[model samples]
Target chain A: LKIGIIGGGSVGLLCAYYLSLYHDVTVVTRRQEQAAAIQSEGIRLYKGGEEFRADCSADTSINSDFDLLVVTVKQHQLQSVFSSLERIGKTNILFLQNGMGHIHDLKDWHVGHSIYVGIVEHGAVRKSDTAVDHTGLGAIKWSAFDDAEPDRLNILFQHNHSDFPIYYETDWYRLLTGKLIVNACINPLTALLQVKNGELLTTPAYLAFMKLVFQEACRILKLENEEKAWERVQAVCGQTKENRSSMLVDVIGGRQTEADAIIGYLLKEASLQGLDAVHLEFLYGSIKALE
Target chain B: SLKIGIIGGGSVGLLCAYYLSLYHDVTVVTRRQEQAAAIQSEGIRLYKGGEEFRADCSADTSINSDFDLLVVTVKQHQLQSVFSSLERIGKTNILFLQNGMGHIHDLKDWHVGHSIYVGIVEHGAVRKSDTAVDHTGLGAIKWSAFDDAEPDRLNILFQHNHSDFPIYYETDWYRLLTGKLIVNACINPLTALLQVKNGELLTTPAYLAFMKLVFQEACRILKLENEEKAWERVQAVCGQTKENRSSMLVDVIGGRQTEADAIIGYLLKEASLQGLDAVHLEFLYGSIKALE
Candidate 1:
């Protein structure tokens, strides 16, 4: 199977490096320098106290000949290349971005292609243009849309192991909303308080803030089993204890955040339901102002 | 002329001593021996309107006095030490010049029928030294008797009122202190937390939201006669002290203990008694307590 991964970031690099092990893989990156480095030296992957290089192709342009294209850019960065994606015309695409904000963007485009959404649980960091370190090993849960074949994509399942596994999710809304609830609670509070994931559990005030954000989002989403959602959030905080949340890292690194995609999405939904989630609005406005 | 013995040689103590020494005999008692000696040697030096004057007065290290009237000028936290000394005095008239309503109960606890009164100082003074105070702004001293006293005794206080340092007697002590507590509750914790001037609470949306929530919670528990009138008073205080850092902010910045118990603690106690949910007050109290 020929696989093409877009956006050459950490997630893209990790997927390309791993998929190249069992199939023909090419990574599509925006940086010409990264492309040249990948073309000359191949993709450098460091995982589980072991380091190795994989032979793969890298380019600035997306090759339409590939069987599957994995979209792994940040949500904001996706808008910049939406036009180029239109030209692919019915190629299988998998989106791997945080939050549910991108669903509207895809539906509006109405591409004549099978679209798949992924909830990436792996933690990978791009060391450089040509190197990526798989910091934590987790599975990628995916949902297919518009008659995308799940069994024909046996390569996606064949790679499933204790480390980098992949699973099919029947209900995309439930999966994505679960992820959204965790991100919506953890991201903004950590970003505003300037703490790591685990530090939020140290102070009662910070913990109360997390609970309020989680409860508010759960209420707005009308989730009957909010306790389970809250447990998932706490588990994520425990799992990513040492890691700074994506929003915090974004703010500290002087980059834009996915706050609109995470917190703003909930706020929009609450307004549509004629509900006033002041805490959600407050957090959304605060993160926006900080940016 | 009445012999006034003012305790706690803080800014308020020094200011009251300097003002009262003009028309009455005044002596300041301080806990620090060095401060007492400094006042005894140099007298009370007061700076007002680009001029300085020394008011000759006596200073003592303790409240060993039988003066006509006694003034307590210590901060709320320092009041515990003042109590030990006050137990030594016998039936001397007492006046308390403190910020919050917390001290009123303590006074009642140590009631020996000394005719207590509370003076809410509106003037701003900064102590330059043990015996020197800069009168930054002059406003009237509003006093309300916690217990009725003789008219002749009140005349001694009325004579001390001037155009610069006027004194007004208020009949309703509970109403006045409630109003003062609302103002303190709204202004202090917010300015301390945000590190902003008083006017910012009126102007900034986030700060103003917290202010209104705190005030609303307080008014709910207080059950004041007119909510609009109380709100007007709070706004007026913010307007007048537009640039001044609230006392809580000053204490927090200077690394001194704030009078959280005197202000928020009183509100919390009231909330517990009335079975009212004062979450805003509780949060503010907790935040300040955490900072402390």
Candidate 2:
């Protein structure tokens, strides 16, 4: 089996390197300099104290056929990347990101049932143009929105992925809740507070903050007693302990944050509930005002 | 008439003792009992714009002093030891003028079904010495009963008060306490934190940021219905003489513990119930923790 991965940043490159060793892989990335460097020097994947440089096809355009086509970009780039992939066959598209819904974007792009949503909770970061760092193991949860051939897609992820866990849950509700709560609690505070993943755990101040955000998220999601919120948050924070969460990394790097969707979505929902969204409103205002 | 005696030599105790003395003969019992001797010898020196009038009063350190009333005015933390003295003090009507929440929980366990009125004073005061206090701000003082006191008795308590401030009653203790809690959460912490006067906190951006945290915590704990809670708070600070400092300022200037345990501590306790990290309150908590 062969897999085609797009946007050869860290996640794209790491996914390419991992899937290629077991099966044939094609890396579909832009940025000619990075692609040219990767094509010449090959992809360097550093993990478990060993740096493995593997020969792989790294190109600046999507010109290959494979069983799977993965779009691995930051949450903000989802629309543009998906637009480019619109010409590609939908049945093979897989969306992997840590922010809010790619599934909604998929629907909007008229690409429903043709794509797979994979919420990456693992720690994989780019060290340079050609080198990628993998620090933790996270689950890849995928589902086919409109596909009648659900079992086939499930088997494809199950058979092709193992270095990191590949999980498929029929209960979309459960999967979405796990993703939402983690984003709500970790994403905004980490971004707004400008702290590291592990630093949040160390500060008594942040821990109390985490609980407030967690409970608020659960309340908004209508899943207050949902035990999975806490579990997912702990697991994600534990996995990314040494790594900076993408939102924090974004703000410090002077890039736009996923806060609009992660935290902004909460305000939108809060307004619907007829509840005063003071905290959420303040946070939203602060983030935008600072920006 | 509801006769009340205020104990301790602090601002709240002294002022309440003097004000209530307008309609009731007020006696202040205190450890710094010598302040009474000083007052007796020199008259309570009242200083204000270009004039000083001696306030007629008696002060002594008598745990067993007899009166028809008792107003415990020590810091909220001192109530544990103060309660021990209540046993022999006779069945005087007791009103708690100290700031903070859950003091009544202590009072409830100690005083049982006794009449306990919780009072919150807006007046600004600081001690110049053991006996002398500078009344820097003239502000209203609000007090209330867990239930309504005898109407005639309450009228007697409010009438002819030389201090030009209103004394009103609120049957709902929590609502009235909410007013004071927001003020404490905002003013007390800010003034002490920036090492500035009460009005100066409004000028300092750093103090306002700190005030924001405390205000957010208090608003959440009190389940405040409107944003005006904070606005009303700032208004309370403005009503004070611009140069006036708060109790926390007095504490910090004297190198003593501020009434944080009664103010922010109550908010932190509620934070625990709401399953929130008192990040805002954590700043004040660090101060308390360091003092220990």
Candidate 3:
């Protein structure tokens, strides 16, 4: 499969660097400078005591069709990419974005290509146009969208290597929405407080505040067995205590955030479901303010 | 017109002393004898824009009921510490110029004839030393009677008011205080948390949106009726004090105690009484306290 990764961000670069081993991967970036940088220097991936460099072709735009067009841009960037995606005709499109909000964009579409929904559990940051730091190596999972044929990216399952493992989940909605709930609890609070993920739990009052936000989000999202979701959320915070949330990083860098996709998604769902998500609403407004 | 005794040697206290001293016989009642001595010796050096002047005023560590009117300019949190003395300063009319409405609720134990008057100082001031304060903004001291019908008692202080330093008499005490409170809750914690100027609250869309969230929760908790004016007032404040950092931000940076509990803490109590989910206020209360 000639894999074309749209948007050469931290995640895009990480995916491009890893998947090129099993498939021909070309990174499609927004900036011509980034495209040139990746083409010239390849993807420089740094882990704690280890560093790996890889060679891959890159371009400013999607010049040719892809076997798998893994769109790794921010959720807000989806609409702009939709036009280019339409130009490419039929391709196995794997949409990997934050939050479940982007799902709303596909409802009116009638494209024949196999479209998949995916989420990244891995933590990666872009140091430069061609430099990426793989902070936490976690599995990248996807599921065949209910709207698509479901068999195009089946080849991704075999390349589930120890380093760059890919996973297939039958329930993509649960995977993303459940992760959405976890994100709704942690990300905005940390970004607002200007603290690390673990700081919410370390302080007693902050932990209580975090729980209040979680409870409101759970009811609005209609999450079942909420206790389990909460435990996992806390465990993730515990595991990533020192790590800065992606939202927090965006705010510090004075860049636009995925707040619209993450908290924005929850608020819309709450509204459509006729639920009062005061905590989520508060966070949504606050995170948007930070952006 | 009166011998005004201004308590607490903080920026607000000093600002009150600097201006009010021009029209009346002034006495500063502070906690520290050193501050009292410094003010008595050097007087109050005020830097407001182009002008710098040293205003003379008597200073003391003791609360003197002998003064015509006693003004309390302490932080809301420090009110209880001086409550014993303010209790002893019994019959004298006391004016409180604090940030939040908690003072009104907590000063319930004031003796008969204490004649409590609450005011919100919109003027910004920063204390450089024991006897020096910079009048950061030229806003006014707006006061209202806390327990009396006709605050004819506090009229004399307003009579001698300078055009440079204005004094306003508010008709509705609760509305006046709560209006100021809404502005405080929206701007203080946000400026403190983000470490930005007050204007950024309005200039930045995300921050302004966040300010709206805090504003909505505060308005609901306070049961504010005039929301349109309240929101406009809030934005206008940010615009007026664009370059200024909020008191909370200054407190956080200076490593001093903030009036977080006074503003948001008091609102959280109102939120509870009204059976409201003030998660935004609660989060802010927790976050600001955590940062402290």
Candidate 4:
């Protein structure tokens, strides 16, 4: 199987490394600087108490037709990075992003290629341009949107190959929303408060706020068992105890946060649904107040 | 003449005492022994035009002197401690130059004072220390009858006042406060909500939304002519100080009790009266909502 990876961040590097284990794999990255670093010293991945280095063939762009293409860039950069995706003409492309906005981008891009969705519960980050760090243990849920059409992308994500465990889903957006509901809770509040995921439990005010945030997502997604939704929120908070969310990373760095893309986005949905999203509105107002 | 006694060592309380002292003999009542000693060692310092002058005044943590009028300038949550000390000053004019809704009424309901007033001073002030006030804005003071009294007390306040600070009397106290309240609804909440500043809202979407929310809630509460009319009034007040840090921001930044109850608290009260929960208002700007 031939695999092509776009992005050299943690996700891109990890995908390229694992795929190279059993088949021919190529990595497409933004900068020649990263590719140069990987070319000189090889790509270093720290995982499972061991450091693995591979001199993987990294490219600055995707110029050839491959059996499969996996995209692993930030949600905001997905559209621009994936511009040449349709040029692959007949390749199967799988987007492993974690939200609805990317699907909106997918709709806008209107790629003719067969689209596969990848929902990764695995958490990873870039230690540097040459190194990747895996923080949490999770799996990647993969599925082709339309089963009537055969998916060749599954070959690279095949079980017999090194990149196993590519599960299929009939409804990709539904799975994305399921993850979105959880991300919606943990991401924005964690970011806005500039606290750890578990620190949300530090005060009753924040706990009640978590309920409000979870319900904001649940309301928009029409999620059931509002209590269960918050219980799941507690579990996620417990899972990522000391880690600062990306939003918090943005906050501390004084960069623009994705509060609008996530929190405000769900809030706009609730408003369209004619629900009393006062709490959500407050979150939006409060976060916007920060800027 | 109204003998004013303020109970906090913060900027708002001290400035009220300083400005009011120009026409009246003012005594500042604080709770910190260190602050009292600092003021005693060096009298209240007034900084203007690149110079600092000392005002001859005495400071005490405990109320020891009888005052014709007692002004409580303490934080909103410190009312219990303030009231415990305020009980010492008898038969005096008591006005709270603070923000928020519940405490002023708390003072009237609890204290045995002969007269009480609720006031919101629009003056810009920052607490530099125990004896200094950084004058920010030359604002006005708006006061009204806390109880259902005739216009007699209004005369004493207007005629016997110290300093040339403009003071206005409203038949309905809430009506006069609506202006400051509107500013809070727009400014303070955003500053705390966004954790930004007063000037930031001048050209941001957050500021525009804040103004819109305030106007909508004000119309509902004030029963004003329309949104346009309320917004025009909002614009007038907004034009007053585009570069001043609101009381709510002051509280949040200083880690003190804000005038949240008076400002957004009133919004919630009006929401209840209208049989519609100003849940949006409460969440976005209310002290209990923001803090708790």
Candidate 5:
């Protein structure tokens, strides 16, 4: 099977590296430099404690040779690749993008291809083009989106290495909404406040701010019980307290962030629900202002 | 025209010097000699209501005149230094046009010996350069008797500056300061933090509520019993000057020191003493100061 990864970022490179083991992989990238490096040098991956490289062809654009396309871009950037996605014929599409934000953006996502959504649990860092370091090896979970059948998705699930595996689930909303809430609770506050991840949990006042964010977020997400949701976010904050959230790092570095997926995702839902979530609104505005 | 002395060469200071010079002999004082030198050489260029007005006036870095009326136009944080160097007032009928609740508590030494007046400037103005000012909004300057400001001195000053630049003498100084305090505390910190134009808050329900949240806390501490009217007053200010970016926002954009301490700091003190919970004010104060 020919697999196409439409992103060249850290996650895209890591997925292309591992998935290449089971299929013919082409790491599609926006830059010729990134593609040339991977095409000439192979996908350089540092796993466990040593170097493990995977061979994969690299291209600047997608073509008809792809049987399945894995869109591993961030939620905010989904629109960028939407044009590329439009040119391809009906095929199985697995969206590895995070956040429920893509739901509205993908209203017609199922035009002809089967739509699937999932969460990537592995912590990946890319040193440069054609290079990725898989630091954490958590299993990936995915499911058929909304009404699409899970047909041929087993092409992704059936065969996997003992080191890395993909699991299947029917509840797509649970997979995304769970991660969305935690990211929403911790990410925006950390970015705007310019504090480490734990401050949202350690500082009482900041914790109060975090709760307001969590509640307004829960409203937009239409979640039933944030009493349970609140503790889960706190626990994540507790574990990652000293760490800068990915969104925080992105903001300080003045790079694009997934706030669109995390906070902006809920905001889109709030717009349709005709609800007022000022806390989240303020957070969203402040975060945008920083970048 | 009576002789008038205005201290501080910032936005409102230059605006007052420019307009008041039309009716009186004016000297704009600033600690920076460059502001004084530029202003003295070029006069003041006021871009007002799509028309340009050249204001002819005197400028100096030091207080060298026995002005008939003294107008203190420095920010609250600058008041201490102004007082430190202001060894004598020469019994000039003085008028204080500082924003937010500041230097009032520190005015005890001068308030007893001088005829003092406290007021709020309603006209929206921003400083474009050392000798340039932009009069963006048109409103009146309303003052109240801090010490029953001398009859003749007040009469002639407000009496001469009329038409297109109105001045009103209100009955109570406390109410005047507190009213203006409410407007600044409610709108200033939030806009500076959000760095948006005044109208952005009203357009978004969430942002509008965020503004009102700060407003409610300010009204409680200021003892503004007419909460409904105060809220309306804030929204009206936002509406009337919708396009104007707040002074606090300007302070932030330029990375200059803001009146956060003068505005929100004063309210937080009032709230703490009264045992009021002003968590929003607490949050906003930190937010504004961080950028400062």
Candidate 6:
């Protein structure tokens, strides 16, 4: 099987490294220097107590007619590649971007390609232009958009190893909302307060604030079993106790964050539902202004 | 003609005592014994226009009811510690001199049954030590009768106004306080949070936006007449004190307690009572408290 990853970020590199283990993989990067470096040094991935290099091709352009294409860029960076995707026509595509805002963009494309939306529970960090560290071990949940079976990419589910596992979820709405709920509630608060994930749990006022943020998003999203939703949020906080959120990392690096995609979508939904979302609006406006 | 007991040994308290000592008998009440001893031995040294002088006065830990007028000159937070001492003075006459309107509600609830007057000091003074102060910028004092019955006490305050430290009387206490409250609401927290000077709020577009939102929220919560009046007052203040840091910013930098409770906290309380949505003010208030 031939696979192409559209971004050279941590998620893109992680996907390229793992998917290269069994098939031909090509990683597409925006920078020529990064492509040249990756072409020479190959892709270096750090996992557990070992480090190794994966043999794969890296380029500044995509062939478009590959067996599958995975989009892993930041949501804000997704638009720059839309023209490139338009040429891809009916190629199978998988999207792994954070937040549920891009779902509408994907739906509007009308490219007739089999689309799959994924929520990556794995925590990976880009160490360099050609290297990434798999910081956390979790499963990747993907679902077909039109109830189509993702059997052509059997390479994804071929291995259910402890380091990195992949699973298919039928209820993409629940999966995406669960992921969005956690990111919406936790990311901006951790970023704005400049604290680790666990600090939100440790600080009483911060924890109280986190609940308000989560409750507001849940009320607007009409999330069922709110107590269970809160439990999922708490679980994410506990899992990433020592890790800085991606939003915080983006803020510290002085880069644009996914605040508009994450919190902004919830605000839009609230307005459509005629619900008052004062807390969410505050958080959203704060992060947007901060960026 | 009247004995004035000035509470608080801060810059404002000391300045009032020094100026009042020239015309009336003055006794400064301070919590710290060392401060009292320093003022008693060295007198109150004041620096103005590159000249200095020691105004002889009395300093003690407490004052009795002998004073015909008791001028309370302390920050809002300091009032909490001096309530017991104020109760001991027997409520002859009080001229509460403080920034922001929070203390007015507090004083009303204290219910001392005395003639009460409130004054807003526009002069900028900094306490150098326990006994001295630098009068950085000289301005007039605006006073209004809250419940004062004695015209003689007001006369003593009026006649003592020198060219450098002039005093004026105001007719509407609510108008004066609301204007000052609006200015403080817009300027203090912005400076403190952004760690910028007073002019930054007007100079930076983003900071100016935050200031507008904060001012709008405060006006709605307070049910003021119009935003342009408050905006005009805020801009005039920014122009006058372009380079100066706000008191709240100074407090935050020095790691001292802020009047957040007195200023922003007071605004939040009003919003809660009036059922107004003041989330911006609440955010600013919470952020200030978190920093402290």
Candidate number of the best DockQ: 5
Q: Which candidate is the best by TM-score?
A: 5
Query: Which residue runs does candidate 6 get wrong by more than 4 Å?
Result: A193-212, A224-255, A271-275, B1-96, B100-118, B121-152, B159-261, B265-283
Clashes of each: 0, 1, 2, 12, 1, 0
Lowest summed-lDDT stretch of 10 residues in model 5 chain A? A105-114
Candidate 2: which stretches are off by over 4 Å?
A101-103, A152-162, A186-212, A224-258, A272-276, A283-291, B1-292
Residue B109, candidate 5: C-alpha displacement in angstroms: 9.9
Listed per prediction, chain B TM-scores read 0.94, 0.81, 0.92, 0.81, 0.89, 0.94
Model 4 agreement with the true structure over B120-210: per-residue lDDT tens digits? 8877777888889876667778777777544476575457554446787766676665655665676677667666556656566545664
lDDT of 3 by residue, B216-275 (tens): 989988989899899999999899789988879888878888898898899988888888
User: Which of 1 and 2 is ahead in TM-score?
Assistant: 1
Model 1 over residues B187-236: C-alpha lDDT tens digits?
99877766778897788665666677778889988888899889888989
Cα DockQ of the candidate 4 complex: 0.20
Per-candidate TM-scores read: 0.69, 0.51, 0.68, 0.72, 0.81, 0.65
Instruction: Place model 1 in a CAPRI quality band.
Output: incorrect
lDDT of 4 at B203: 61
In model 4, what is the error at residue A76, expressed in angstroms? 5.8
Considering DockQ, which of the candidate structures 1 and 6 is the better prediction for this target?
1
Candidate 3 at residue A46, lDDT? 91
Model-by-model lDDT, in order? 0.81, 0.67, 0.82, 0.68, 0.82, 0.81
Candidate 2 lDDT over residue span A1-291, tens digit each? 767788888788788777776667777776888778877887899888989876777777667656777888766677677667765554477777655545445556665336566667667878998888887766577765555355656545555446666777675545666677776777656665666677667888877767766776677777745676677687788777886677767766777776676777776666678654444544454456335
CA RMSD for every model? 6.1, 11.3, 6.9, 6.1, 4.4, 7.3
lDDT of 3 by residue, A45-124 (tens): 89887888888889977877678899888765788899888777787888888887788886666677788988898988
Model 2: share of true interface contacts reproduced: 0.16
Give the Cα error of residue A174 in candidate 5, in Å. 2.6
**Interface RMSD of every predicted model, in angstroms:** 5.6, 8.4, 5.6, 6.2, 1.8, 6.4
